[PDB]
Structure 1
Amino acid sequence: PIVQNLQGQMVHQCISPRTLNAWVKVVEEKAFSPEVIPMFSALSCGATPQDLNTMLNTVGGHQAAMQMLKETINEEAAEWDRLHPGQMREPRGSDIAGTTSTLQEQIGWMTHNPPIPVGEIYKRWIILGLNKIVRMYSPTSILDIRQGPKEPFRDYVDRFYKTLRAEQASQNAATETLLVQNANPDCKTILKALGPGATLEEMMTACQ
């Protein structure tokens, strides 16, 4: 990663072993749950393209999803070439992904004046691929999330928005109407009686 000293200069540092282990443990314990993407973005703060490849390469299984991620990176690299086809040489799509660029060249673009943040650009592509993976690996559709007859309303809302976050790539009024439609008859009657425009706080209080 590229960080700055206690004095105040941008320097390259080796990826910490604690960061490497934290990322491996997240994939092993959470698979591709939606919260894996914000964890990846945080653990790769200031990462070079080389660091991002290191993090992706330490992932054990899930190689079908990883190949899909590599294909997404290939698409974004080709689109970058179409949008960008004494003067400094500017990076190609393969330079941002780190397949045709050295660490020295990556540091050059990132600490140039003005800078080309090849690390941030690459991270954008990776997060795009990770979003496509989370959506596909979502077990259930949001339309199949229905409150059981003996399931508390709070536990039902937990499954609802957990599913919604995986399908929307963590990114409305149709959601609220679906949450009410798929509540059990007793709770739905109460929710209907609350009048439109009720907050989630008022809905969960009314169905306690």
Structure 2
Amino acid sequence: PIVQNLQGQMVYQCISPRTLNAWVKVVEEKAFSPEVIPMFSALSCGATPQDLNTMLNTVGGHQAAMQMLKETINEEAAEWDRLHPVIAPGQMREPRGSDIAGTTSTLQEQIGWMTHNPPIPVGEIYKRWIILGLNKIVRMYSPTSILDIRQGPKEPFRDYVDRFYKTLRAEQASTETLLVQNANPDCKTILKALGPGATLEEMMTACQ
């Protein structure tokens, strides 16, 4: 990644083994649970396109997902080339979609773009494409419809609400009415009596 060293200027540093291991392990443990995406974004802070490709390529499993991600990246790269069409000796060339994705650009070129004044943030642009692709995978691999999250007869309301919003997160909605409808008979009666405008805190307190 590009890091502001202990002095000032922005400079390339190798990806740390701790970062590499952290990413490999979170994918192994969590697969494509929604929270893996913010972890990816955090672990790839300041990443060049080369670094982003390193992180994606170190994943051993989930090759269906990684092929789907490649398709999303290729679509975004094509849309870049449509909107931003393009060798002077010693001068910086303009990046194409495949340069942003790191397949046809060098690390030196990537650093050159990212540290230019003004900066051409190829790492951040590529990361956006990757996260777009990862979100699609999270949605596809979401096991259950929100319609099928219903509170059990002996299920604590808190545990039901956890399942409900876990599912909504994976299905990726932009809500409280379905939460009441899918509650068990006893909780539903309590929640109906609260009326409109009740906060989640108030609902959870009422059913505790």
Same topology, TM > 0.5: yes
CA contact 2:92–2:112 (8 Å) conserved in 1: no
User: What is the rounded CA distance, in whole Å, between the counterparts of 2:61 and 2:97 in structure 1?
Assistant: 27
C-alpha deviation, 1:136, in angstroms: 0.5
Q: 1:87: how far off? A: 7.1
| 1:184-207 residue CA offsets vs partner (Å, 9 max, x unmatched) | 011001000001010000101111
Aligned position for 1:24: 24
Q: Is the 8 A contact 1:141 1:163 kept in 2?
A: yes
Q: Are the equivalent residues in 2 in contact too, given 1:131–1:169 (CA < 8 A)?
A: no
- TM-score scaled by structure 2? 0.95
Structure 2 SS opposite 1:11: strand
Deviation at 1:86, TM superposition (A): 9.1
Whether contact under 8 Å (2:114, 2:123) holds in the other structure is: yes
Note the C-alpha offset of 1:4.
1.1
Aligned length: 204
Is 1:139 the equivalent of 2:143? yes
Contact 1:33/1:166 (<8 A) preserved: yes
How far is the alpha carbon of 1:9 from its aligned partner?
A: 1.1
Aligned equivalents of 2:127 and 2:13: distance in 1? 18
Aligned equivalents of 2:17 and 2:90: distance in 1? 40
Cα shift at 1:5: 1.3
Cα distance per residue 1:97-135 (max 9 Å; x no partner): 000000010001001111100000000000000000000
Deviations 1:11-43 (A, max 9, x none): 100000000000000000000000000000000
Q: Indicate if the aligned counterparts of 1:32 and 1:134 stay in contact, CA closer than 8 A.
A: yes
Partner SS state of residue 3, structure 2? strand
Separation (CA, whole Å) in 2 of partners of 1:77 and 1:68: 14
2:98 and 2:155 mapped to 1: Cα distance?
51
Structure 1: runs of 5+ lacking an equivalent: none
Shift of 1:71: 0.5
For structure 2, the residue ranges without an aligned partner over 5 or more in a row are none
What SS does the corresponding residue of 2:201 show, helix, strand or coil?
Answer: helix
Structure 1 residue 138: Cα displacement? 0.3
Question: Per-residue deviation at 1:169?
Answer: 6.7
Q: Distance in 2 between matches of 1:108 and 1:169?
A: 39
CA RMSD of aligned residues (A): 1.9
Tell me if structure 2 keeps the 8 A contact 1:34–1:169.
Answer: no
TM-aligned CA distance change 1:143 to 1:162, over 3 Å: same
| Partner in structure 2 of residue 87 of structure 1 | 91
Q: Is the 8 A contact 1:24 1:58 kept in 2?
A: yes
Which secondary structure state, in structure 1, belongs to the residue aligned with residue 143 of structure 2? Answer: coil
Contact in 2 for aligned 1:135/1:168 (Cα 8 Å):
yes
Q: Per-residue CA shift, 1:36-64, capped at 9, x if unaligned? A: 00000000000000000000001011000
Pairwise CA distance, 1:88:
3.9
Whole-angstrom CA distance in 2 between matches of 1:22 and 1:86:
39
Corresponding residue to 1:106 among 102, 105, 110: 110
CA offset at residue 67 of structure 1? 0.2
- Answer whether contact 2:23 2:55 (CA < 8 A) is retained: yes
Give the TM-score taking structure 1 as reference length: 0.95
Q: In structure 2, what is the Cα distance between the partners aligned to 1:75 and 1:169?
A: 24
Q: Relative to structure 1, is the Cα distance of residues 38 and 7 closer, same or farther in structure 2, using a 3 angstrom cutoff?
A: same
